[PDB]
Design an enzyme around this catalytic site. Structure first.
Site, short mmCIF file in Angstrom:
data_model
loop_
_atom_site.label_atom_id
_atom_site.label_comp_id
_atom_site.label_asym_id
_atom_site.label_seq_id
_atom_site.Cartn_x
_atom_site.Cartn_y
_atom_site.Cartn_z
N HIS A 107 0.80 -1.21 0.00
CA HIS A 107 0.00 0.00 0.00
C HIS A 107 0.83 1.25 0.00
CE1 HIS A 107 -3.68 2.25 1.22
NE2 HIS A 107 -2.78 3.04 1.79
N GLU A 108 1.81 1.33 0.94
CA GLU A 108 2.65 2.49 0.97
C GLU A 108 3.49 2.72 -0.25
OE1 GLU A 108 2.05 4.63 3.23
OE2 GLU A 108 0.56 3.26 4.09
N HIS A 111 1.63 4.56 -2.78
CA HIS A 111 1.76 6.02 -2.62
C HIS A 111 3.10 6.57 -3.02
CE1 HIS A 111 -2.10 6.44 -0.58
NE2 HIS A 111 -1.76 5.76 0.52
N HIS A 117 -5.69 6.84 -2.96
CA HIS A 117 -6.49 5.79 -2.50
C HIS A 117 -7.53 5.38 -3.54
CE1 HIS A 117 -5.35 6.72 1.91
NE2 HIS A 117 -4.57 5.78 1.42
#
Ligand SMILES: COc1ccc(-c2ccc(S(=O)(=O)c3ccccc3CC(=O)NO)cc2)cc1
Ligand SMILES: [Ca+2]
Ligand SMILES: [Ca+2]
Ligand SMILES: [Ca+2]
Ligand SMILES: [Zn+2]
Ligand SMILES: [Zn+2]
Length: 152
Positions: A107-108, A111, A117
């Site tokens: 997930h990170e 980014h 998101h």
């Protein structure tokens, strides 16, 4: 398309080798669906720094203790750009029994590479942690759409 990353420091929650493996596998998830080539460096100036820290840790986005915010990461850029920070007040794990580092890192890193998101709950970029067996984990088509929109 060639991006370096460095693990700044290692959570005492896990063995150092387990942290390395989780992070390497997390970058591999994104590399498997893009032209991106990631290279781990041990020392020196990397595009993406991985850091474990707690509370206020030098970036104007302090962590909040156990629970709440797990991690955050900055989009691509100079300096803190691209970096991925993990709240050491969580209990990072290779599997479950805490907050799974691999999944969180997927997930990170999303980014880090410039993704926001998702509104798709099957996407890793949907901001609800849920453990899934690491071997059956797969990016959703929405994650692949997002990342391919930036790279390629
Ligand atoms: C399927 O594997 C996953 C999916 C989602 C995440 C994930 C989910 C939430 C968060 S969080 O820090 O609690 C959070 C929650 C809501 C809004 C923002 C945030 C911060 C955030 O999005 N950091 O990237 C951080 C990571 C972690 C792992
Ligand atoms: Ca927290
Ligand atoms: Ca950086
Ligand atoms: Ca911890
Ligand atoms: Zn931070
Ligand atoms: Zn997020």
């Amino acid at each position: 398309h060639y991006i370096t990353y460095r693990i700044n420091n290692y959570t005492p929650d896990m063995n150092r080798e387990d942290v390395d493996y989780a992070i390497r596998k997390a970058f591999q998830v994104w590399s498997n669906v893009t032209p991106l080539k990631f290279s781990k460096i041990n020392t020196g100036m990397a595009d993406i720094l991985v850091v474990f820290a707690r509370g206020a840790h030098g970036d104007d986005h302090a962590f909040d203790g156990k629970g709440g915010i797990l991690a955050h990461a900055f989009g691509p850029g100079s300096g803190i750009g691209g970096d991925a920070h993990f709240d050491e007040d969580e209990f990072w794990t290779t599997h479950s029994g805490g907050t799974n580092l691999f999944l969180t890192a997927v997930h990170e890193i999303g980014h880090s590479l410039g993704l926001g998101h998702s509104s798709d709950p099957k996407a890793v970029m949907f901001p609800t942690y849920k453990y899934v067996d690491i071997n059956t984990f797969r990016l959703s088509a929405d994650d692949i759409r997002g990342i391919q929109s930036l790279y390629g």
